[PDB]
Amino acid sequence: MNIIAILNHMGVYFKEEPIRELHKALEALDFQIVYPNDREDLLKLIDNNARLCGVIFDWDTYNLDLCEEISAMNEHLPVYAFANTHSTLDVSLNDLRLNVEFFEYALGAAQDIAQKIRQSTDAYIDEILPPLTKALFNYVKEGKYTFCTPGHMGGTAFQKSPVGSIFYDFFGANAMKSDISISVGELGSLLDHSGPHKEAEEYIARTFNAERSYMVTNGTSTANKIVGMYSAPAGSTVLIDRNCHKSLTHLMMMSDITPIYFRPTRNAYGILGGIPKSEFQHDTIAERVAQTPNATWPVHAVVTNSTYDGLLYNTDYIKEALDVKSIHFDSAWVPYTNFSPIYKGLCGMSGGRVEGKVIYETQSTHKLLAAFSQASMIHVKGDINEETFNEAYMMHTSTSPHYGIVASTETAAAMMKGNAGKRLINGSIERAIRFRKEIKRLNSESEGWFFDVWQPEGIDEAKCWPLDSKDNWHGFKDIDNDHMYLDPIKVTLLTPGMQKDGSMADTGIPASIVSKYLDEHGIIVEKTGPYNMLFLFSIGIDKTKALSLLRALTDFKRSYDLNLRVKNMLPSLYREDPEFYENMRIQELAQGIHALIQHHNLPDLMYRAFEVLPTMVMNPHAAFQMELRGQTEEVYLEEMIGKVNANMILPYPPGVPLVMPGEMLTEESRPVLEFLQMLCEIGAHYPGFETDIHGAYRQADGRYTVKVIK
Amino acid sequence: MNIIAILNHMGVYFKEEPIRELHKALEALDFQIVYPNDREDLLKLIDNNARLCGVIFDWDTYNLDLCEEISAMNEHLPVYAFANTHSTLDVSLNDLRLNVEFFEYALGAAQDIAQKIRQSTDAYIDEILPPLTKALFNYVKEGKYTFCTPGHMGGTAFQKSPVGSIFYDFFGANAMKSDISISVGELGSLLDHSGPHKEAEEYIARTFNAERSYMVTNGTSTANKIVGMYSAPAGSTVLIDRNCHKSLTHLMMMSDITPIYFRPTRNAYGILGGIPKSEFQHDTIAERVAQTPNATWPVHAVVTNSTYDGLLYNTDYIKEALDVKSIHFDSAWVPYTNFSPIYKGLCGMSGGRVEGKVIYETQSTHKLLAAFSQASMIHVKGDINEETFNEAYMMHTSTSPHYGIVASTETAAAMMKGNAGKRLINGSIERAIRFRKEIKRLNSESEGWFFDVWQPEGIDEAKCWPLDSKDNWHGFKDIDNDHMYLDPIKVTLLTPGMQKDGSMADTGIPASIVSKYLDEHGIIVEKTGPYNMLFLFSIGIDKTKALSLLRALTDFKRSYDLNLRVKNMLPSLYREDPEFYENMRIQELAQGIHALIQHHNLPDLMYRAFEVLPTMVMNPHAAFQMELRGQTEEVYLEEMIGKVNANMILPYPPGVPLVMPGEMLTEESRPVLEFLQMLCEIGAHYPGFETDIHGAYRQADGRYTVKVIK
Ligand SMILES: Cc1ncc(COP(=O)(O)O)c(/C=N/N[C@@H](CCCCN)C(=O)O)c1O
Ligand SMILES: Cc1ncc(COP(=O)(O)O)c(/C=N/N[C@@H](CCCCN)C(=O)O)c1O
């Protein structure tokens, strides 16, 4: 934060000479000076360089409308106007609202003006930094000696070791110096919500539109467990989105809570849809309660919003219609919903208090904002017993939190404020929409096959596009209207191989091949389904990366159409079993995988296996407890029918839990088993494309076993 | 060739100032000046830096005995003595034989003296360069434009191409400019023996103690074919060393000559021994002639000297005892025998003319001297029809010889001249002997197994050590005395696994594992047997490389004793087959290979298969002609018995021809087949350690087939 832009070349010595002296004095104060040629140049510099901490210009040449243009980009950026002919009578109230400091031209005044500019820069830095992060940085500047944990003592231990010194050089001194503990009393305590931490929490709650907020240093998995434990005592009944992250299943294995499942939808691609509106109704829930043994009226409900693939619920209807006192929106994938009006009504914290209810949002700050991994947030709107919640919170948080992760959470909040933060979010959305339109254009002008994008036909303006029953782009049958919306940030590209009616074509390109090719060429996809690839167009994606992705996709298409050899196209895959992949070409491998998928009818089996719910014989807690008592046996996959499962079976694809612990496959649930059996067969043909079934175990002979209650 | 050493730091201006001015003038003439501190420093500088082209010293400080010391290292190196108090009366006749030029101290004389020194340096360069190489370099200096072959026109074509430019940058401009053809008339012609080429030949014949010499640009394989085709007309009988290179078999395949085989010996390691003296006798040859169909008294004889493993014959006894008018010594591995008295009587060109006989030596200049690959020599001592020999010569030589290869042959000859060349050869021999002694000392010091060296006990002084029937180090049974000698240059290291009596030990380390480890650590062995590794301590081996090899061997021993994992110890082997080599450790792999070798009794089968000669049914020419007519069939190995072989079977180990084309395996020759069958089994257990049988073909099912006369 040390770049100062000087805008003029004035042609009079009485201005130029003081400006040259000021240049020298500022450089003595450790500033880097840049010289834009004109106002458009300056505005571009500001747009492209966030380290620009100040602008100097001549008030005679440029009016204060230049300050208005600067402030529209960054309302806190200090601007220094040098006055010669203008006086106090030439400024208006609106002008005086801007962060402008006025100086005059004089020989010998460079030193005090530079001192004033240094003070203003420090004030700018202080204004944009959040309280905890500022306190941490100031403590580091103090350079105190520690005889307390952590044992590396501000990085000293690393410097005394060869390999430690390599680690220290990689991560840098500041990262080590800022790794501290609650022995440093001036920073307060996260667990006690004291000092700067308290301020941070309030800061976050204000930025994220929450009544209360909590920083979590072990991910949204831990955040979910905190919320669930506070909300669902033992013996209670909980409504669970069947498209729940396995953290919720872990919570159920930990606490003796009886689940009743919301049933979401799916399309032919295996992309998860939303829970239909009828599942939120009182009568449906009551009937399910009546049929479920040891079930009562639910005290807590958990809904995944958004889905992994970017489908958001209209949350106003859910908050109105779900007759449960506590509603928890697992919003891991959408921590940005408060920072753009296009998400209004599509997030848990949207709007005000719901009478008689408490709404939680759990957000993964590290997933789609800028924070270190494991940084997570809990947002609460509604009445809670603060002390009991604090107990549930401390039960899952370490007594030695990583201060860097905490500071990054606060800093993500700070990055979201003001004109600069609005530009960040809006720019990310606009970039995603431009990329989507470009994919559509390239697909249109492609002579043969090209990548498609999963979206409505005519996207024009930045918004969350509704899923409507008439349109068939989304592939969901008989979907409720004004219910599901697509987040433009989450871009799903489709490889050829599936027809528009839900069947698969004669030829196809499985998306795993494309993801491997992209990895070989320096591009990492978020995830890959059978014929879809997910790309996150977050605030960390710039034009360079998007254009590079387009170039990589066209390169893959050209290489595939030339039918290159796997040894050349995919060398790392070839290094897996070089004997198998000799003289094997790309089109043959792709067609073999596609024909294996088709012959086994993978889409129909995947769809049917997730449409029938396996029978719940005991809650996951009881089954897990019996597994802890060593009362389970490993049996083969063909014998699952009638056996109570001890473990969650989570297959990829589609990447969502298929069997929960305590559930039993009956005859009416046989397709589940068939699907799994199928995943075994297809997984045993091409190295590098192995089966991936959590909860199943590959034996030495190549068969698969599962653990069941003995 | 531009480094000038100035030796003094005097205390008088009338000397120092002219020397400083001379420094400046010489640097203007593109010389690099160095300043040794004392005479011992200067002598070390000369010893270590062959680019030192001149020495300047003060005659007052140092007498001309310094010039004697310099000349003992390089008798052509120019020395410039500055005279102040000494006069013409202070030089003796012996002193005036040294290459000393005398100057005086005077201000303003630096330019003239520097010009004289430049002329002397040019004279030195001209004196040590051989004629053809000098002519080639001068032509390149002329920079003529070519409209003739080669088509790259002195490298211009490469410069006009991107990838061509990469190639040109790698090999350099001079390499391209010197690639010329006989369209350049001033260089003469290799095929015509005209101009510089003629001079070169004479130069070579003088340096290598031959009456006539020929340069060959397609290796000693081509040299062997030239000699053989001149010496053995169709229908003649030739005596052939059974340990013959495949080139002699190729000659027999193209020429209708009937062979009778010298039988060499072998030891338990599979190292080839020498032909016993009785095989050279008239009675044995006559008896073999009377039993071979269509055999007459031999007109030509071919003997491999030395063997690959460094065993040299006493060639005087052979020249006296072999009653054949033409004797060809295939001396590919020993081109250096004329340049050290320790090889006296152990090479084909040793001594004078043998009355009534012609002696040939074929030498691979590129193998053990300094020449580009494919550079070879033919040396002739005795009467030949020069015109017929010239026909045999050109009918194996291309009309577009590579001038670089030819020049490198001549330059290797030039490198062998004078005090510098004698120092080269003697230094290489002493270096080899020091390494051998160090291996012995390290083996004595080792606690447990260590590498051994194949040599007699207590080698002391530089010589070719005789193989005697009393000693058992060589492992040859009932060897004639004063017959075979070991070349110290060829260093054979032994890994544990074989006992001193020829039996197989209970534990062993196959040498292929050591060679793979050495390759992984930047050291390339010449070749590897089952329990032996061959290292060539040529004139290209210095102290740095020998110490590096010792360190690598001790590192291997330490790593093996720690029993490291193959994944870490041998990464490339693991990458050959990652599934097989996961979690395998080095000791297990070595012991498995050793037990495979022992259980099949590889040494006994190897020895027995090469002790009985397969029956000749037709000469190799007839069998090869039948193969060219399509009258061969592919059969399996177990059906070998009774089938005339169409191709040479040459297995590794022991790396020498086992079956010749036209030979047939009978019941009495069954062990040969057994050995081969054994090799097949041995090669089918460890990836990276596959079977290697030339003339056998591995089928898809894994079996092996050979081609036989239908
Ligand atoms: C809906 C939902 N709720 C909570 C969490 C846990 O949040 P934390 O991971 O912060 O504890 C995740 C995590 N989802 N992440 C992926 C793998 C990681 C991403 C790889 N680029 C998964 O587990 O399926 C979630 O999807
Ligand atoms: C005795 C003998 N006479 C002639 C020749 C042919 O001489 P050219 O190779 O110049 O045509 C060779 C060649 N022997 N070379 C090795 C492999 C190359 C060396 C690897 N570092 C072999 O063939 O087994 C020979 O041993």
Instruction: Annotate B223-265 with three-state secondary structure.
Output: HHHHHHHHHCCCCCEEEEECCCCHHHHHHHHHCCCEEEEECCC
How many angstroms separate the alpha carbon of residue A540 from the centre of ligand 1?
A: 18
3-state SS, residue B302: strand
Reported in sequence order, the residue ranges of A585-637 that DSSP labels E, i.e. its strands, are 615-616, 632-636
What is the chain A residue with the closest CA to B572? A575
Q: CA-CA distance, B245 to B360, in Å (whole number)? A: 16
Distance of CA B451 to the CA centre of its chain: 24
Residues in chain B with CB shorter than 8 Å from the CB of A572 are none
Q: CA-CA distance, A157 to A166, in Å (whole number)? A: 12
Interface residue of B579, B581, B583 to substitute, partner A, most A CBs within 10 Å: B579
Q: Is the bond into B654 cis (omega within 30 degrees of 0)?
A: yes
Q: Is the CB of A121 under 6 A from ligand 1?
A: no
Residues in chain B with CB shorter than 8 Å from the CB of A576 are 578
Distance of CA A400 to the CA centre of its chain: 25
Q: Which residues contact B336 (CB under 8 A, 6 or more apart)?
A: B343, B368, B369, B416, B425, B489, B539
Nearest to B411 by CA among B365, B362, B348: B365
- Element holding A680 (H helix, E strand): helix A670-682
Distance of CA A62 to the CA centre of its chain: 43
Interface residue of A572, A574, A579 to substitute, partner B, most B CBs within 10 Å: A579
Residue with tokens 């009006």: A341
By the 8 A CB rule, do A661 and A705 touch? no
Q: CA-CA distance, A582 to A560, in Å (whole number)? A: 17
Residue A116: how many CB atoms within 10 A of its CB? 13
Could you tell me which residues are beta bridge partners of residue B534? Answer: B492, B527
Note the resolution in Å, 1 decimal: 2.0
**Quick one: residue B465, left, alpha or beta (phi over 0 = left, psi -120 to 50 = alpha)?**
beta
Strand-by-strand arrangement of the A100-104 sheet: A32-34, A3-7, A52-58, A79-83, A100-104
Q: Which atom of ligand 2 is nearest to the CA of B374?
A: 10
Q: CA-CA distance, B202 to B61, in Å (whole number)? A: 44
How many angstroms separate the alpha carbon of residue A686 from the centre of ligand 1?
A: 28
By the 8 A CB rule, do B488 and B343 touch? no
Q: CA-CA distance, B557 to A678, in Å (whole number)? A: 51
By the 8 A CB rule, do A307 and A281 touch? no
User: What is residue B279's DSSP assignment?
Assistant: G
Interface of B with A (CB under 8 A): 575, 577-579
Please judge whether B579 and A577 are an interchain contact, meaning their C-beta atoms are less than 8 angstroms apart. yes
Q: Which amino acid is at B308?
A: Y
Tell me how long chain B is: 710
Q: Would you list the DSSP string of A198-212?
A: HHHHHHHHHHTT-SE
Residues in chain A with CB shorter than 8 Å from the CB of B579 are 577
How many CB pairs (< 8 A) connect A and B?
Answer: 5
Ligand 2 pocket test: pick from B215, B216, B217, B220 the residue with the most ligand atoms within 8 Å of its Cβ.
B220
By the 8 A CB rule, do A60 and A35 touch? no
3-state SS, residue A177: helix
By the 8 A CB rule, do B56 and B4 touch? yes
Nearest to B154 by CA among B177, B182, B181, B184: B177
Residues in chain B with CB shorter than 8 Å from the CB of A575 are 575
Q: Is the CB of B332 under 6 A from ligand 2?
A: yes
Residue B262 dihedral angles phi and psi, to the nearest 5°: -65, 135
- Determine the distance in angstroms separating the CA of A700 from the nearest CA of chain B, rounded to an integer: 13
**Interaxial angle between packed helices B418-445 and B543-561, expressed in degrees from 0 to 180 and rounded to the nearest 10:** 20
Ligand 1 pocket test: pick from A367, A368, A396, A408 the residue with the most ligand atoms within 8 Å of its Cβ.
A367
Q: Which atom of ligand 2 is nearest to the CA of B246?
A: 23
CA atoms within 13 A on the CB side of A290: 6
Pairing state of beta strands B696-698 and B3-7?
A: unpaired
Reported in sequence order, the residue ranges of A268-426 that DSSP labels E, i.e. its strands, are 300-304, 311-313, 326-330, 358-363, 376-381
Tokens of B552: 């690598």
Q: CA-CA distance, B178 to B184, in Å (whole number)? A: 11
Strand-by-strand arrangement of the A311-313 sheet: A311-313, A484-486, A465-466
How many angstroms separate the alpha carbon of residue A534 from the centre of ligand 1?
A: 14
Interface of A with B (CB under 8 A): 575-577, 579
Biggest alpha carbon–alpha carbon distance for chain B: 94
Tell me the CA distances in angstroms from B458 to B225, B386, B462, B465, one per residue in order: 41, 48, 12, 11
Counts of helices then strands in chain B (DSSP H, E): 27, 26
How many angstroms separate the alpha carbon of residue B245 from the centre of ligand 2?
A: 7
By the 8 A CB rule, do A326 and A357 touch? yes
By the 8 A CB rule, do B455 and B473 touch? yes
3-state SS, residue A57: strand
Residues in chain A with CB shorter than 8 Å from the CB of B578 are 576-577
Q: Which atom of ligand 2 is nearest to the CA of B304?
A: 1
Q: Which residues contact B547 (CB under 8 A, 6 or more apart)?
A: none
By the 8 A CB rule, do B644 and B708 touch? yes
Q: CA-CA distance, A657 to A678, in Å (whole number)? A: 17
CA atoms within 13 A on the CB side of A372: 14
Q: Which amino acid is at B224?
A: N
Q: Is the CB of A219 under 6 A from ligand 1?
A: yes
Distance of CA A409 to the CA centre of its chain: 13
Q: CA-CA distance, B211 to B351, in Å (whole number)? A: 12
Biggest alpha carbon–alpha carbon distance for chain A: 94
3-state SS, residue A316: helix
Q: Is the CB of B221 under 6 A from ligand 2?
A: yes
Please classify residue A120 by burial: count the beta carbons closer than 10 Å to its beta carbon, then call 0-12 exposed, 13-18 middle and 19+ buried.
middle
By the 8 A CB rule, do A313 and A279 touch? no
Q: Which atom of ligand 1 is nearest to the CA of A244?
A: 1
- Determine the distance in angstroms separating the CA of A673 from the nearest CA of chain B, rounded to an integer: 30
Q: Which amino acid is at B423?
A: R
Please judge whether A577 and B575 are an interchain contact, meaning their C-beta atoms are less than 8 angstroms apart. no
Q: CA-CA distance, B5 to B399, in Å (whole number)? A: 46
3-state SS, residue A695: coil
Residues in chain A with CB shorter than 8 Å from the CB of B577 are 579
Please classify residue A456 by burial: count the beta carbons closer than 10 Å to its beta carbon, then call 0-12 exposed, 13-18 middle and 19+ buried.
middle
Q: CA-CA distance, A449 to A561, in Å (whole number)? A: 10
Residue with tokens 């753009």: A340
Residues in chain B with CB shorter than 8 Å from the CB of A579 are 577
Q: CA-CA distance, B619 to B257, in Å (whole number)? A: 7
How many angstroms separate the alpha carbon of residue A208 from the centre of ligand 2?
A: 79
By the 8 A CB rule, do A78 and A99 touch? yes
Please judge whether A575 and B579 are an interchain contact, meaning their C-beta atoms are less than 8 angstroms apart. no
Nearest to B63 by CA among B38, B41, B91, B89: B91
Could you tell me which residues are beta bridge partners of residue B52? Answer: B3
Tokens of A669: 């649930």
Please classify residue A545 by burial: count the beta carbons closer than 10 Å to its beta carbon, then call 0-12 exposed, 13-18 middle and 19+ buried.
middle
Q: Which amino acid is at B34?
A: V
Listed by the residue before each break, gaps in chain B with C–N over 2.5 Å are none
Please classify residue A235 by burial: count the beta carbons closer than 10 Å to its beta carbon, then call 0-12 exposed, 13-18 middle and 19+ buried.
exposed
Q: Which residues contact A395 (CB under 8 A, 6 or more apart)?
A: A226, A229
Please judge whether A576 and B575 are an interchain contact, meaning their C-beta atoms are less than 8 angstroms apart. no
Q: CA-CA distance, B528 to A79, in Å (whole number)? A: 77
Q: CA-CA distance, A696 to B4, in Å (whole number)? A: 78
Handedness of CA B206, B209, B211, B215 (dihedral sign): negative
Tell me how long chain A is: 710
